[PDB]
Every structure is written in C-alpha cells, then in structure tokens.
Amino acid sequence: QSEAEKARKELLELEALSMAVESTGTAKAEAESRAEAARIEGEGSVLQAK
Amino acid sequence: QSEAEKARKELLELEALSMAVESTGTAKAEAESRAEAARIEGEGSVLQAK
C-alpha cells in the first residue's frame, strides 16, 4: 500500500494539472466570448448614436 | 492511470481550444447580426426623418 500511495502521488499531481487546464480553458472561453459580444455591441451603439 | 492522465492533459487542452472557438464564434455571429440590423435601421430612420 505504501508503494501504491507513492505512485498515487504522481497520479494526483497529473490529475491536478489536467483539472486546472480544463477549468481555466472553460472560464477563459466564456469570458472572451462575452467580452467580444460586448465590444461589438459597443461599436454598434456608437454608430447608432451617430 | 498516470500515463492515461498524461494523455488526458493534452486532450483537455485541445477540448478547451475547441470550446473557446465555438463560444466566440457564436457570440460574434449574433453580435454582428444585431449590429448590422441596427445600422440598417438607423440609416432608414435618417431617411424617414428627412
């Protein structure tokens, strides 16, 4: 069981890296989509105001 | 399982890229459609005012 835990430590490190990658990817994708939509809406608003 | 997680990290990176592409594409498409509609409506409004 000690040897199994020795391997499980590295396995958990890899799992943590994968989880961080997935979470940051999802968050950045949603944030960038919303930001692009807001920028387009703002430019349209400027033109409509003119 | 450690090797499987090693591969899964790259798989999740690719999935994050694909998700970001899809989200930004949908958002920008909807925003640009609404902006074009607003611009056409504004030009029509100017002509109607004249």
Side-chain angles (χ1 to χ4, degrees):
Chain A
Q1 296 182 4
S2 170
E3 292 294 328
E5 285 292 332
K6 275 185 184 179
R8 191 174 171 271
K9 174 168 176 286
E10 305 298 75
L11 164 58
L12 291 175
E13 275 183 345
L14 295 183
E15 293 192 359
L17 278 180
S18 298
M19 204 176 319
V21 158
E22 183 271 324
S23 297
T24 191
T26 308
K28 86 174 305 279
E30 181 166 356
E32 280 182 346
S33 78
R34 285 180 292 168
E36 213 61 30
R39 177 188 67 85
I40 282 171
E41 290 168 357
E43 296 177 354
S45 297
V46 153
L47 198 57
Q48 294 167 10
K50 206 193 300 278
Chain B
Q1 296 182 4
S2 170
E3 292 294 328
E5 285 292 332
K6 275 185 184 179
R8 191 174 171 271
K9 174 168 176 286
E10 305 298 75
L11 164 58
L12 291 175
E13 275 183 345
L14 295 183
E15 293 192 359
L17 278 180
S18 298
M19 204 176 319
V21 158
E22 183 271 324
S23 297
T24 191
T26 308
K28 86 174 305 279
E30 181 166 356
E32 280 182 346
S33 78
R34 285 180 292 168
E36 213 61 30
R39 177 188 67 85
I40 282 171
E41 290 168 357
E43 296 177 354
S45 297
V46 153
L47 198 57
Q48 294 167 10
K50 206 193 300 278

PDB file of all heavy atoms in Angstrom, chain B residues 2-22:
ATOM      1  N   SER B   2      -1.607   6.850 -14.452  1.00  0.00           N
ATOM      2  CA  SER B   2      -0.767   8.037 -14.591  1.00  0.00           C
ATOM      3  C   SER B   2      -0.502   8.356 -16.058  1.00  0.00           C
ATOM      4  O   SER B   2      -0.588   9.520 -16.477  1.00  0.00           O
ATOM      5  CB  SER B   2       0.549   7.840 -13.843  1.00  0.00           C
ATOM      6  OG  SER B   2       1.467   8.876 -14.147  1.00  0.00           O
ATOM      7  N   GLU B   3      -0.185   7.335 -16.858  1.00  0.00           N
ATOM      8  CA  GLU B   3       0.017   7.559 -18.291  1.00  0.00           C
ATOM      9  C   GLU B   3      -1.265   8.051 -18.962  1.00  0.00           C
ATOM     10  O   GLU B   3      -1.233   8.945 -19.827  1.00  0.00           O
ATOM     11  CB  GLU B   3       0.512   6.278 -18.960  1.00  0.00           C
ATOM     12  CG  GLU B   3       1.916   5.861 -18.556  1.00  0.00           C
ATOM     13  CD  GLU B   3       2.973   6.846 -19.017  1.00  0.00           C
ATOM     14  OE1 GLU B   3       2.786   7.466 -20.082  1.00  0.00           O
ATOM     15  OE2 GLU B   3       3.995   6.997 -18.311  1.00  0.00           O
ATOM     16  N   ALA B   4      -2.403   7.473 -18.574  1.00  0.00           N
ATOM     17  CA  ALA B   4      -3.681   7.908 -19.128  1.00  0.00           C
ATOM     18  C   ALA B   4      -3.947   9.374 -18.817  1.00  0.00           C
ATOM     19  O   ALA B   4      -4.421  10.122 -19.677  1.00  0.00           O
ATOM     20  CB  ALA B   4      -4.811   7.029 -18.596  1.00  0.00           C
ATOM     21  N   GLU B   5      -3.639   9.808 -17.591  1.00  0.00           N
ATOM     22  CA  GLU B   5      -3.803  11.216 -17.243  1.00  0.00           C
ATOM     23  C   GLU B   5      -2.833  12.096 -18.024  1.00  0.00           C
ATOM     24  O   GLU B   5      -3.169  13.231 -18.397  1.00  0.00           O
ATOM     25  CB  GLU B   5      -3.615  11.411 -15.741  1.00  0.00           C
ATOM     26  CG  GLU B   5      -4.791  10.937 -14.905  1.00  0.00           C
ATOM     27  CD  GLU B   5      -6.029  11.790 -15.099  1.00  0.00           C
ATOM     28  OE1 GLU B   5      -5.885  12.986 -15.422  1.00  0.00           O
ATOM     29  OE2 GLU B   5      -7.147  11.264 -14.922  1.00  0.00           O
ATOM     30  N   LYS B   6      -1.619  11.591 -18.273  1.00  0.00           N
ATOM     31  CA  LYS B   6      -0.668  12.329 -19.098  1.00  0.00           C
ATOM     32  C   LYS B   6      -1.252  12.628 -20.473  1.00  0.00           C
ATOM     33  O   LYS B   6      -1.121  13.748 -20.983  1.00  0.00           O
ATOM     34  CB  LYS B   6       0.635  11.544 -19.235  1.00  0.00           C
ATOM     35  CG  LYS B   6       1.618  11.751 -18.103  1.00  0.00           C
ATOM     36  CD  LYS B   6       2.923  11.026 -18.384  1.00  0.00           C
ATOM     37  CE  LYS B   6       3.886  11.144 -17.218  1.00  0.00           C
ATOM     38  NZ  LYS B   6       5.155  10.413 -17.480  1.00  0.00           N
ATOM     39  N   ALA B   7      -1.889  11.635 -21.092  1.00  0.00           N
ATOM     40  CA  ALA B   7      -2.540  11.885 -22.382  1.00  0.00           C
ATOM     41  C   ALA B   7      -3.768  12.783 -22.229  1.00  0.00           C
ATOM     42  O   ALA B   7      -4.037  13.651 -23.079  1.00  0.00           O
ATOM     43  CB  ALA B   7      -2.923  10.561 -23.041  1.00  0.00           C
ATOM     44  N   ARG B   8      -4.523  12.584 -21.146  1.00  0.00           N
ATOM     45  CA  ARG B   8      -5.757  13.332 -20.943  1.00  0.00           C
ATOM     46  C   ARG B   8      -5.492  14.822 -20.781  1.00  0.00           C
ATOM     47  O   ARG B   8      -6.364  15.638 -21.092  1.00  0.00           O
ATOM     48  CB  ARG B   8      -6.494  12.780 -19.724  1.00  0.00           C
ATOM     49  CG  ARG B   8      -7.909  13.295 -19.548  1.00  0.00           C
ATOM     50  CD  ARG B   8      -8.598  12.584 -18.395  1.00  0.00           C
ATOM     51  NE  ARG B   8      -9.876  13.202 -18.059  1.00  0.00           N
ATOM     52  CZ  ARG B   8     -10.021  14.192 -17.189  1.00  0.00           C
ATOM     53  NH1 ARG B   8      -8.985  14.707 -16.548  1.00  0.00           N
ATOM     54  NH2 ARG B   8     -11.238  14.677 -16.954  1.00  0.00           N
ATOM     55  N   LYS B   9      -4.306  15.199 -20.302  1.00  0.00           N
ATOM     56  CA  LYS B   9      -3.983  16.621 -20.197  1.00  0.00           C
ATOM     57  C   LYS B   9      -3.994  17.295 -21.568  1.00  0.00           C
ATOM     58  O   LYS B   9      -4.627  18.346 -21.757  1.00  0.00           O
ATOM     59  CB  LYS B   9      -2.624  16.801 -19.519  1.00  0.00           C
ATOM     60  CG  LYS B   9      -2.138  18.242 -19.482  1.00  0.00           C
ATOM     61  CD  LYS B   9      -0.944  18.397 -18.556  1.00  0.00           C
ATOM     62  CE  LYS B   9      -0.398  19.814 -18.593  1.00  0.00           C
ATOM     63  NZ  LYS B   9       0.358  20.088 -19.846  1.00  0.00           N
ATOM     64  N   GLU B  10      -3.304  16.697 -22.543  1.00  0.00           N
ATOM     65  CA  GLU B  10      -3.309  17.241 -23.899  1.00  0.00           C
ATOM     66  C   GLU B  10      -4.708  17.195 -24.500  1.00  0.00           C
ATOM     67  O   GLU B  10      -5.127  18.129 -25.202  1.00  0.00           O
ATOM     68  CB  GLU B  10      -2.321  16.471 -24.777  1.00  0.00           C
ATOM     69  CG  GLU B  10      -0.894  16.403 -24.240  1.00  0.00           C
ATOM     70  CD  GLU B  10      -0.235  17.766 -24.101  1.00  0.00           C
ATOM     71  OE1 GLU B  10      -0.576  18.512 -23.158  1.00  0.00           O
ATOM     72  OE2 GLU B  10       0.630  18.093 -24.939  1.00  0.00           O
ATOM     73  N   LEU B  11      -5.441  16.107 -24.243  1.00  0.00           N
ATOM     74  CA  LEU B  11      -6.810  16.028 -24.752  1.00  0.00           C
ATOM     75  C   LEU B  11      -7.661  17.177 -24.217  1.00  0.00           C
ATOM     76  O   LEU B  11      -8.430  17.797 -24.964  1.00  0.00           O
ATOM     77  CB  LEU B  11      -7.427  14.680 -24.386  1.00  0.00           C
ATOM     78  CG  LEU B  11      -8.949  14.534 -24.498  1.00  0.00           C
ATOM     79  CD1 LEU B  11      -9.424  14.838 -25.910  1.00  0.00           C
ATOM     80  CD2 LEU B  11      -9.386  13.145 -24.071  1.00  0.00           C
ATOM     81  N   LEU B  12      -7.519  17.493 -22.927  1.00  0.00           N
ATOM     82  CA  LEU B  12      -8.297  18.573 -22.332  1.00  0.00           C
ATOM     83  C   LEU B  12      -7.869  19.930 -22.871  1.00  0.00           C
ATOM     84  O   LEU B  12      -8.705  20.832 -23.022  1.00  0.00           O
ATOM     85  CB  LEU B  12      -8.173  18.541 -20.810  1.00  0.00           C
ATOM     86  CG  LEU B  12      -8.842  17.366 -20.096  1.00  0.00           C
ATOM     87  CD1 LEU B  12      -8.527  17.402 -18.610  1.00  0.00           C
ATOM     88  CD2 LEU B  12     -10.341  17.376 -20.331  1.00  0.00           C
ATOM     89  N   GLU B  13      -6.578  20.107 -23.153  1.00  0.00           N
ATOM     90  CA  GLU B  13      -6.136  21.355 -23.774  1.00  0.00           C
ATOM     91  C   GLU B  13      -6.800  21.551 -25.136  1.00  0.00           C
ATOM     92  O   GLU B  13      -7.294  22.646 -25.456  1.00  0.00           O
ATOM     93  CB  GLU B  13      -4.614  21.364 -23.913  1.00  0.00           C
ATOM     94  CG  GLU B  13      -3.880  21.838 -22.673  1.00  0.00           C
ATOM     95  CD  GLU B  13      -2.382  21.908 -22.879  1.00  0.00           C
ATOM     96  OE1 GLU B  13      -1.890  21.334 -23.872  1.00  0.00           O
ATOM     97  OE2 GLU B  13      -1.694  22.537 -22.047  1.00  0.00           O
ATOM     98  N   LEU B  14      -6.834  20.490 -25.944  1.00  0.00           N
ATOM     99  CA  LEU B  14      -7.488  20.589 -27.249  1.00  0.00           C
ATOM    100  C   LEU B  14      -8.980  20.867 -27.099  1.00  0.00           C
ATOM    101  O   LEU B  14      -9.552  21.669 -27.850  1.00  0.00           O
ATOM    102  CB  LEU B  14      -7.256  19.312 -28.053  1.00  0.00           C
ATOM    103  CG  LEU B  14      -5.805  19.033 -28.446  1.00  0.00           C
ATOM    104  CD1 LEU B  14      -5.711  17.781 -29.299  1.00  0.00           C
ATOM    105  CD2 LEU B  14      -5.205  20.227 -29.167  1.00  0.00           C
ATOM    106  N   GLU B  15      -9.628  20.214 -26.131  1.00  0.00           N
ATOM    107  CA  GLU B  15     -11.050  20.456 -25.901  1.00  0.00           C
ATOM    108  C   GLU B  15     -11.306  21.899 -25.487  1.00  0.00           C
ATOM    109  O   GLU B  15     -12.301  22.506 -25.903  1.00  0.00           O
ATOM    110  CB  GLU B  15     -11.584  19.496 -24.839  1.00  0.00           C
ATOM    111  CG  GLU B  15     -11.603  18.041 -25.263  1.00  0.00           C
ATOM    112  CD  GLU B  15     -12.397  17.176 -24.310  1.00  0.00           C
ATOM    113  OE1 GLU B  15     -12.913  17.713 -23.310  1.00  0.00           O
ATOM    114  OE2 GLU B  15     -12.505  15.957 -24.560  1.00  0.00           O
ATOM    115  N   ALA B  16     -10.425  22.463 -24.656  1.00  0.00           N
ATOM    116  CA  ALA B  16     -10.573  23.855 -24.249  1.00  0.00           C
ATOM    117  C   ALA B  16     -10.449  24.789 -25.445  1.00  0.00           C
ATOM    118  O   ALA B  16     -11.222  25.748 -25.578  1.00  0.00           O
ATOM    119  CB  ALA B  16      -9.538  24.206 -23.183  1.00  0.00           C
ATOM    120  N   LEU B  17      -9.483  24.524 -26.329  1.00  0.00           N
ATOM    121  CA  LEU B  17      -9.358  25.345 -27.533  1.00  0.00           C
ATOM    122  C   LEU B  17     -10.623  25.273 -28.381  1.00  0.00           C
ATOM    123  O   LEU B  17     -11.129  26.304 -28.852  1.00  0.00           O
ATOM    124  CB  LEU B  17      -8.144  24.911 -28.350  1.00  0.00           C
ATOM    125  CG  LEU B  17      -6.786  25.466 -27.921  1.00  0.00           C
ATOM    126  CD1 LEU B  17      -5.683  24.936 -28.820  1.00  0.00           C
ATOM    127  CD2 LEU B  17      -6.806  26.985 -27.932  1.00  0.00           C
ATOM    128  N   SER B  18     -11.155  24.063 -28.578  1.00  0.00           N
ATOM    129  CA  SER B  18     -12.363  23.910 -29.387  1.00  0.00           C
ATOM    130  C   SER B  18     -13.551  24.634 -28.756  1.00  0.00           C
ATOM    131  O   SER B  18     -14.336  25.288 -29.459  1.00  0.00           O
ATOM    132  CB  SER B  18     -12.679  22.428 -29.578  1.00  0.00           C
ATOM    133  OG  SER B  18     -11.639  21.771 -30.277  1.00  0.00           O
ATOM    134  N   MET B  19     -13.703  24.518 -27.433  1.00  0.00           N
ATOM    135  CA  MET B  19     -14.806  25.186 -26.750  1.00  0.00           C
ATOM    136  C   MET B  19     -14.703  26.699 -26.882  1.00  0.00           C
ATOM    137  O   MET B  19     -15.710  27.381 -27.119  1.00  0.00           O
ATOM    138  CB  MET B  19     -14.833  24.782 -25.278  1.00  0.00           C
ATOM    139  CG  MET B  19     -16.191  24.926 -24.616  1.00  0.00           C
ATOM    140  SD  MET B  19     -16.192  24.339 -22.911  1.00  0.00           S
ATOM    141  CE  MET B  19     -15.208  22.852 -23.062  1.00  0.00           C
ATOM    142  N   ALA B  20     -13.493  27.241 -26.726  1.00  0.00           N
ATOM    143  CA  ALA B  20     -13.310  28.679 -26.888  1.00  0.00           C
ATOM    144  C   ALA B  20     -13.675  29.119 -28.298  1.00  0.00           C
ATOM    145  O   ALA B  20     -14.359  30.136 -28.483  1.00  0.00           O
ATOM    146  CB  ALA B  20     -11.871  29.069 -26.558  1.00  0.00           C
ATOM    147  N   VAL B  21     -13.237  28.357 -29.304  1.00  0.00           N
ATOM    148  CA  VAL B  21     -13.551  28.703 -30.689  1.00  0.00           C
ATOM    149  C   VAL B  21     -15.061  28.727 -30.904  1.00  0.00           C
ATOM    150  O   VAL B  21     -15.612  29.683 -31.464  1.00  0.00           O
ATOM    151  CB  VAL B  21     -12.861  27.725 -31.658  1.00  0.00           C
ATOM    152  CG1 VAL B  21     -13.565  27.715 -33.004  1.00  0.00           C
ATOM    153  CG2 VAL B  21     -11.396  28.096 -31.829  1.00  0.00           C
ATOM    154  N   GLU B  22     -15.751  27.683 -30.440  1.00  0.00           N
ATOM    155  CA  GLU B  22     -17.197  27.601 -30.643  1.00  0.00           C
ATOM    156  C   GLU B  22     -17.918  28.762 -29.961  1.00  0.00           C
ATOM    157  O   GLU B  22     -18.788  29.412 -30.564  1.00  0.00           O
ATOM    158  CB  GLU B  22     -17.713  26.257 -30.129  1.00  0.00           C
ATOM    159  CG  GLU B  22     -19.197  26.014 -30.350  1.00  0.00           C
ATOM    160  CD  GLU B  22     -20.053  26.524 -29.208  1.00  0.00           C
ATOM    161  OE1 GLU B  22     -19.605  26.438 -28.044  1.00  0.00           O
ATOM    162  OE2 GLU B  22     -21.172  27.014 -29.470  1.00  0.00           O
TER     163      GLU B  22
END
